[PDB]
Amino acid sequence: GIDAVYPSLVGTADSKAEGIKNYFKLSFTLPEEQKSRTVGSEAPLKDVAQALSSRARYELFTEKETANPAFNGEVIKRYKELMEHGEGIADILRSRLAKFLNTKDVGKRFAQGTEANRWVGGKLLNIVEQDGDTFKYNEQLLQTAVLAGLQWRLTATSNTAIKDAKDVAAITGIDQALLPEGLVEQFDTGMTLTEAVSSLAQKIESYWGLSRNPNAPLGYTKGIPTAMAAEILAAFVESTDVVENIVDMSEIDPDNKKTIGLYTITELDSFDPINSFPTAIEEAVLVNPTEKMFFGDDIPPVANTQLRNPAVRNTPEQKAALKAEQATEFYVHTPMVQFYETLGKDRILELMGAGTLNKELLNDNHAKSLEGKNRSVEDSYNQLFSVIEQVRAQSEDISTVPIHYAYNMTRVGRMQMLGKYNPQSAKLVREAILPTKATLDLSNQNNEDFSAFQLGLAQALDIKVHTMTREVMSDELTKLLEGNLKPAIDMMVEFNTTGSLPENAVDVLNTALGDRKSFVALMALMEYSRYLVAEDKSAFVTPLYVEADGVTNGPINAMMLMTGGLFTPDWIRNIAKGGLFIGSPNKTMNEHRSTADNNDLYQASTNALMESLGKLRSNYASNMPIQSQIDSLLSLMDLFLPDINLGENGALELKRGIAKNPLTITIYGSGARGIAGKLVSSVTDAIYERMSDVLKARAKDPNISAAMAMFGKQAASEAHAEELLARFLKDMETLTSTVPVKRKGVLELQSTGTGAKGKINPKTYTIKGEQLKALQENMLHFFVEPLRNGITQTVGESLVYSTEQLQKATQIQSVVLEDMFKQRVQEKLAEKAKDPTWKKGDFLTQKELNDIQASLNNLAPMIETGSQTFYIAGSENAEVANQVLATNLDDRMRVPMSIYAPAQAGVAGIPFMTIGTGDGMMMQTLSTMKGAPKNTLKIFDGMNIGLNDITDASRKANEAVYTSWQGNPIKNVYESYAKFMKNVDFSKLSPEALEAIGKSALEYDQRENATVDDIANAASLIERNLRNIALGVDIRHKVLDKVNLSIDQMAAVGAPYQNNGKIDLSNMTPEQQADELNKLFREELEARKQKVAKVGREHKASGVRILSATAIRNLAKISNLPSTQAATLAEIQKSLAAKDYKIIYGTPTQVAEYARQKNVTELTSQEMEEAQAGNIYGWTNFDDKTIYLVSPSMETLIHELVHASTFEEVYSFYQGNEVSPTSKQAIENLEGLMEQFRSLDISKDSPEMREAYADAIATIEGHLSNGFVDPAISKAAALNEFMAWGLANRALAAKQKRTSSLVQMVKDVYQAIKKLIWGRKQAPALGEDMFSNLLFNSAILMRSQPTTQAVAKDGTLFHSKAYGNNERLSQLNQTFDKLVTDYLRTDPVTEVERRGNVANALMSATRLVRDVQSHGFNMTAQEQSVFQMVTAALATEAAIDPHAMARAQELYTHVMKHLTVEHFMADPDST
């Protein structure tokens, strides 16, 4: 076979011999079938020459009945020039071979018998021929190789991927948050060495049509094609087809000695005929081409493996979704392609981009950023019109040719189109090729088919169609169609009749569209204008679509799949914002946003951000310079970054589904420092854009001042613009000259040189270096930290806990796999060292590599969910080889060796599970479900549906969401972690491996001297935690399936899905629905647990007993306690009886049932973990003085009697009331001991004592860092928790303990309580039991009035038809909150007469506000509130500063000089 064909190759085919060897004959075998048509071709270049000479000739060679109609006679002439060009390189390669054979007598050395074909650069020589003194190429192998180069030349750039931030930083050595701008853009044209050689190598191997022997070294089955590929690229670069750019990296930073290189390939002209049918060669030399376009009955095949993950196969359920998606037919919209080509490529760039580019009036850093925007549009435009040329040649009518695309699973289970520019990715092609179609009756404007038509138009024109009813949408849409969009429609109508555009087409659209500019907004104008001129509106056919976008699909999916524990009323309200409604059948998002709540998850997080930020600012009241630094940072944000909610809403960027919002980024485990740089990059980018406006304004008028050029649009006068400029200069100087430093838990300011000075120079203004670093330090400490606290409050604390355990479990397992994999290749290589045949430089064979990979199957490296498979650690690293694969003949470019080996997971575990099971499963379920919608384009979290069936396909979208919510990512992970720990051994790991996994399992203080026993014990604890979480999630999903629910997550039409429950939860408060859900949760716990096992007046409806006051006299001495403490009970209980304290006790079922009858909030302490232990604790209601006990005893009754009395002293002292001097000292002493409690060392204490301290310190700091509660209430709660920790841990810290500081702390806190209870009278001696090991275990309930900012910010975004839906008034209120509301005192408001000067102005303004409304100016509810609040702010300011109204007076007199009665008269000639 192999020896039979081309048997003249130099070398001996024998495996082991002392002579020279030809390793090509052993590395590659001969496939039994046919893969390439050039295997038997003596001259492949000339054989295909007669194949591409005529249409008839091309028929026989390809063995097809008919050829592509695009392969006509016009492109025949083009291919002759290109292939003749491909004949000149073959001579260049031959010339280069001769030079190598003579340089340094390398070829002469072969005469003696040197093994020159086994060198790093000599792998190319393995296929050379013998001709005597000299050598020559094998013609068949050489001529076939250049065919792969020609095909690679045409379509290389169409398949290259996009470089990510990490890789760009990796090849640069500097983080992408600090590198200078502009060098990132250079990736657009150039590609690195490995990208170019690897892509070309694959084509050469495929064209040869040979398989790989599994028993051959990896240095020959993978190096021979690479050596050939490097030769072709070197030939091309000297032939001017490829240009090589060498970048010296020492200029930007001297320490970077690296010298990277970029390769760029020359591009053909746009009108070149080769663009019509560029894949003639590929479909001629192959049998199953991969580069193709499918027309008619052609169907793409189904992929067998994931994207860039050969070790993972596609599940049969996954393969079913691939078949359905690839069967959907697309069509080209003829009326839209005419509009694009008539406008022109240059006009498109100006309209979509930043207009015409000129370096004279553009900032240096701003100009280079716009290059990426222009590059993407130009490439997408060229690609779209190259496809149209091929389609137009297939039929007379272009709009009747189906087009099929290809999909494939990615590494996270998401379907992805194959190709860089496709309808799924490029937004330009999305408006030309669509799968949707519809037929509507628009003869009447009051029909039901006209409402669907208006829904598509309104959504495409940037209208929140999912937050208003179907009637408000029509009212708002009609205003646009007759207002600003009127001039644009008139031009569109003219185009639809004569096909021409005005000379100012670009300018007109910019004025009309405004900030609503998008590629889809141009389609809406075309469809509406096409409808007006239509003569028959009863059978209108349009491809317009409506997108069923999800509402915050990221956080919502993670909150519903990775949350455990009892249900909470706060969770119920928060989950309502995502589209889950409990006890409200047939409810939609439109009704919820109009009548219930208009705040979303993004807005809720921002509201909590300012609540915590105000608390932090108040703590530094004694440090004025610190406060001024906070204001400077916030003031700079307002000028340039009014909003922080970023995202993929840009119109000149490809859609990849990557989430960049701060809320979802923080959930995905991103570091605090990383997001600080991202926020700074947005502010600096906004500053540069303002500089371009200064230069642009200077050209128009060379006399305007700097202040008027920058802040002209927001200045009421010339003096107002000076204040804004002066304020901006001071803000930027302070931030870049002073930084905050963290000292022992308190911040401090230090000087770090000089910041920006008083010189603008807008042409060359930039911020970098020390100034840029100082900017991020202020941002991290003053804005990022409060953001984390606010995010956790909304998404729930339990969700954060579930994410931390998931990251640790996946990180530990990844390091072990990586270290073990590296420990077996070294053993195998050392084993081969005693084999004379083996030579250093090669690698293990394919069979050997698989055996090592298959040896880790017992470690469970893959996670199975029943329908999806995940491989987190899989990557194509290169450090495992540390060798050189191959190189050029002249030793110019060296290609390293890359192997597919496991790597460290890092923080990728959290986004893998959420995306893979949350959103990835929904789309897979939607495609394969019964009666799945047809002719739709689902991208990642949305879908495009035709106007005919908007209300039916949207209902099934919500059904898939419900189905995907029944999964359990934690349970799947735990099933792999448990198996991993069964067959693991930490005593055989490398010393560096133990350090890597010690950073996750252990703490900071325990990291040092970490014994291998401590590492094993710590890793076992994480497995236990994962078991409980998977149990809690499973039970919660069972309870929710038994109640009626309405799901409206992924919808904008108003067609929800009902889960057909059986328990009615309607007509109940959200606080009431939690109790019912908790009742079913507890019944499930006891049902499983039992399976494994196989005095006072009594209430009537429940078996609880009520023990009121004046009924505890007998029980005073029943406990027979010593008389020293017996007298205390008489005094303590006497005070309690004066306040009418009542006692209620019973079994857990009885005490919980009684609360539901009387509407009583319960705070019983028990969870799944506590259920196994079997401990239940009651609670105390401080508002009505009621004590609740669960399964009480005589011992615990006495403890609660003194617990309630002690807490009264703590509460009264913090409320400002006078306290006894004996009790005052005790609380004061306890406060002092509290300040030392959070600054202790625990690394030398018992492991169990660490948990007691860690849990106590978590809740203590949480109370002090709360800004929405009364300070008196928060302070009392923190001290009460301090007392509980000391008494609870006394029993076990009084023995087997050393003289540790923490152990000593327990004794001091215990002694302080003794004096407080006993007062000035004699107390029991030290070390004696207080009340038979008295403990504090019952929670305390307290409430207080909310703050002013809490109620003002709640109704800011209220909007409704009957309440008022003025969008502009909503924005005005938002800016009012920042200036005034956010700076009010956090204390709750009071009611005093408040006589004075300012109050007179406020009182007078209130009366004048009412008179205006009753004297001709009727206002709605929304407009009345804004007018009332704004006027109050202007009234108090004018009362303090008499000159504040000087400017407003000037504008008033001018208005009064042009006002007439007829201005307010609608019909001036009325009767």
Add this chain to the structure above:
Amino acid sequence: DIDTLLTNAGTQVMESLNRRMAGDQKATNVQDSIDALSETIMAAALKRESFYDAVATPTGNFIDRANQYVTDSIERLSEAHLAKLTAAIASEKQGEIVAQGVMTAMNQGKVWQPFHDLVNDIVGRTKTNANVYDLIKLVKSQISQDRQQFREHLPTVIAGKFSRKL
């Protein structure tokens, strides 16, 4: 423009006050003045919350919201054919039938027969085993049926005869 100059002259005044509250309020004795301002904002914040939840209805009507609250409150304590008839009366499109009045239309459709059965039980003419709460949920159910068909569906029928949007 004059309107854009007026709003800019307003935020300038607000920004002047913002630079006053951000300073040392206690030292510059503006603490009492700001407290008066916060009272006005608090009072106006609660008033706008009362108007909301008072129109928490798809139709945004005072009466419609009140009826829903009473209907739900009765179902907590208590622990078809006629509806289709009233829908045809308000959906008539003949043009000449609607010109004869509504008394004639009701008689033709025999709407009075389902109505007579319910009233007889309430008065006591016909004995029945239904409790009070079952009958109250019946009378209040038919009242909402008339309002939905006549105050909401009838205007859509009239506007549907025009080929435009007046």
Add this chain to the structure above:
DNA sequence: TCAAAAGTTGCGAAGCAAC
């Protein structure tokens, strides 16, 4: 940060030195 990876030459025939 949710994703493919990734310096360039001289001597000498592997791998360190130099930048």
